[PDB]
Design a protein around this ligand. Sequence first.
Ligand SMILES: *[C@@H]1O[C@H](CO)[C@@H](O)[C@H](O)[C@H]1NC(C)=O
Ligand SMILES: *[C@@H]1O[C@H](CO)[C@@H](O)[C@H](O)[C@H]1NC(C)=O
Ligand SMILES: *[C@@H]1O[C@H](CO)[C@@H](O)[C@H](O)[C@H]1NC(C)=O
Ligand SMILES: *[C@@H]1O[C@H](CO)[C@@H](O)[C@H](O)[C@H]1NC(C)=O
Ligand SMILES: *[C@@H]1O[C@H](CO)[C@@H](O)[C@H](O)[C@H]1NC(C)=O
Ligand SMILES: *[C@@H]1O[C@H](CO)[C@@H](O)[C@H](O)[C@H]1NC(C)=O
Ligand SMILES: *[C@@H]1O[C@H](CO)[C@@H](O)[C@H](O)[C@H]1NC(C)=O
Ligand SMILES: *[C@H]1O[C@H](CO)[C@@H](O)[C@H](O)[C@H]1NC(C)=O
Ligand SMILES: [Ca+2]
Ligand SMILES: [Ca+2]
Lengths: 379, 383
Amino acid sequence: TTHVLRFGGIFEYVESGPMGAEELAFRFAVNTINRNRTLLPNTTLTYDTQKINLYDSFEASKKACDQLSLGVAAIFGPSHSSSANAVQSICNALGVPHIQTRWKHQVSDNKDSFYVSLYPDFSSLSRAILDLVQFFKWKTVTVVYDDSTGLIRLQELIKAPSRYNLRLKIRQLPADTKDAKPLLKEMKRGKEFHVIFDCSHEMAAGILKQALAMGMMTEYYHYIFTTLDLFALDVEPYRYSGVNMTGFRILNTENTQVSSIIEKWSMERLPDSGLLDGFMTTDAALMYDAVHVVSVAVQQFPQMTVSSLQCNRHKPWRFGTRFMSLIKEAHWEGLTGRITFNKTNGLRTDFDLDVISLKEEGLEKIGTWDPASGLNMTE
Amino acid sequence: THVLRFGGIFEYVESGPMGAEELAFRFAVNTINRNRTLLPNTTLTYDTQKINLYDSFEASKKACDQLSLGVAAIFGPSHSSSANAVQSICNALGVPHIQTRWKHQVSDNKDSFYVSLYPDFSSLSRAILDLVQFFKWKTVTVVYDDSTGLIRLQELIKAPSRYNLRLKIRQLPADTKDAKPLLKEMKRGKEFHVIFDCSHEMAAGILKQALAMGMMTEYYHYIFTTLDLFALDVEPYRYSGVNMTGFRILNTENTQVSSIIEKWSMERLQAPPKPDSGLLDGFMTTDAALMYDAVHVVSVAVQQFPQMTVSSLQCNRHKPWRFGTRFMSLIKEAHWEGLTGRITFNKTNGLRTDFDLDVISLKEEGLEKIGTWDPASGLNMTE
Ligand SMILES: *[C@@H]1O[C@H](CO)[C@@H](O)[C@H](O)[C@H]1NC(C)=O
Ligand SMILES: *[C@@H]1O[C@H](CO)[C@@H](O)[C@H](O)[C@H]1NC(C)=O
Ligand SMILES: *[C@@H]1O[C@H](CO)[C@@H](O)[C@H](O)[C@H]1NC(C)=O
Ligand SMILES: *[C@@H]1O[C@H](CO)[C@@H](O)[C@H](O)[C@H]1NC(C)=O
Ligand SMILES: *[C@@H]1O[C@H](CO)[C@@H](O)[C@H](O)[C@H]1NC(C)=O
Ligand SMILES: *[C@@H]1O[C@H](CO)[C@@H](O)[C@H](O)[C@H]1NC(C)=O
Ligand SMILES: *[C@@H]1O[C@H](CO)[C@@H](O)[C@H](O)[C@H]1NC(C)=O
Ligand SMILES: *[C@H]1O[C@H](CO)[C@@H](O)[C@H](O)[C@H]1NC(C)=O
Ligand SMILES: [Ca+2]
Ligand SMILES: [Ca+2]
């Protein structure tokens, strides 16, 4: 009873240093499962990792074909959206499950059915952001987004001013944070004390610097962050100013089992950035959870074996339709909590969140949120 | 006598008439061949592949095939996610990719082998704005079709921080047939000034629900992002005295353009639009006049580069085309007077950020020109 089952992964290219955090979580999971007797006892997980420049969809395609030709049971495809788009179409045509860990816009007309996404969908996250804004009883707010795509992402937030009694201004960051000051100066001048920053944690770390410099880290302002990697941020410079800072957290650290696995990650890993060294970002804990979730579906389908499919020949995989289905019905308790997909969408629309805020002793849990029972504060 | 072949990827119609874009493509090619003054010694040929527009994989396989037959340009697909993939491929093999439909150009993306003939709404958003301020609106309601319209009209959505304006954002549901619950909220909220961001086909259908709801009156004013406003049947509404305003890129005012539009309404083999569609039969949409203009603009660059010839490139082998970098450049510097007016690309972006517009509004005697707009001198009304 020894069977070789191979996953493919397409990751970011760093010709200048260490492998990315996602590719590391991928390999770390595979190894952890192999060492685990209870999961895939008779089965042994192997893999093939290709590295590409993330916005060359053409390259992401050539490498997705190569892996379908070696034989792969799933492509844990790329992060960037336009490259994940192309690998999604390919995986569909050849009926190999595509596992996505990062959000991208699913065009409506698109009928691809061979995929799932582990990123918390903000059909839900937009509503969690909203539930939070109403709890603080804000009546004016200012949404500051990074790249145009954040409007599609937070569209349920942008529309609320027609239903509820709310008035928001929409501002954008410039390409480089190093002059987000002219903008911050307009918000200051306009007494925009309640703000929602829609950007990556790296951008958030850099914006809070400009904000401090501008005298906007005080008891007057309150900042809400869409980013789930709020704990990734160094908070020493601001916890005494008594700004308010709130965001969500998918990464279930409250559990000791998750904390210990996060520590083995800070291990076997490694300034003015504003980020904490040795921290597992959410994008990485999701990849680790995607390998585990797919594997839970593999343990239920021993009959299944890999197959060498070609992008020119057009012979859909034989166990494709059946595997992709086993996946969508999967249940797993990963680093990021309850995993369950939406049979309809393939998306993750139901999950649990910890709502975290900046007290004087650092970031702290002040409640929970799930789409069913909404916000649930502890006081 | 030299044979130069363009490739085109178009929408699949099993098995009715060929789409309007593919027809404008073939119509242009033929018109140029018959024209002595353009490509006199050169003869244009082509290969048209048909694909399902959201299978980017299929649009890829077919883009490779044409690069292998040998093509000087792929007038790639319309849908965005398929035009994305063909854009990357064209880039890797240095064959110009000609786009005629808007799509979001991700910022990090460095592909340089392409141009887009669709009027960019870094400019169109500003033209919509210039118009809103001329009417001196202080409240407006933007209704968009699919999420992507927010990225498109982002310069409009942000204006409430600069100017004195207050807009509500509403969305249409998948199917127009119940845009009534929404229209009923706008009515109840006295949202008399509205901007509809959707296709003309959706606009035709929404105006029906609006009439039914008693919102086609002298109280309402609707602005349309769509450039195909003249595509709409306007008989049912021109007497109600609603106000209806939008822009028009298609230079019909010119007789030469009108006659070519007439040869197009002719030779058209598509069943008239179903009654109850709300559209006029035999009408050249802007998406089609752009494709006709894209074949002509590229051809103006070909006439300047006789040395150039086609080459059979493979998607596995990786040997960029020999005249690629030089052709793609001749294109970006092109100037053409097409059906849609002044064509000129932005050397920086490859996009069409400078163009001319006719601003058109619904008078009682049908749709009418009431001014112009170009990014330089902004709005320019006649009164
Ligand atoms: C807001 O700021 C003050 C001072 O930092 C703090 O005491 C309060 O608890 C904060 N509010 C929340 C929701 O954390
Ligand atoms: C699946 O997706 C839709 C749209 O996002 C959502 O409304 C629906 O409730 C989801 N289904 C489940 C089972 O959660
Ligand atoms: C909400 O939170 C309270 C206290 O934190 C907890 O006791 C309760 O069970 C939660 N309710 C639900 C159903 O989420
Ligand atoms: C095409 O020839 C027509 C005459 O049919 C002429 O009017 C027009 O200028 C020509 N186009 C070009 C490129 O000169
Ligand atoms: C809007 O008002 C009436 C129709 O109700 C029309 O006569 C008038 O010309 C319109 N205004 C413009 C600028 O189109
Ligand atoms: C197009 O170039 C013009 C100047 O030639 C410039 O104003 C504009 O920024 C360019 N395109 C964009 C959208 O950046
Ligand atoms: C605006 O239009 C008028 C005619 O109505 C014309 O005389 C004038 O030149 C135009 N302005 C410019 C330069 O766009
Ligand atoms: C293997 O992981 C640990 C032991 O290493 C065990 O607690 C866990 O349940 C196993 N994995 C599963 C859930 O099959
Ligand atoms: Ca194992
Ligand atoms: Ca000719």
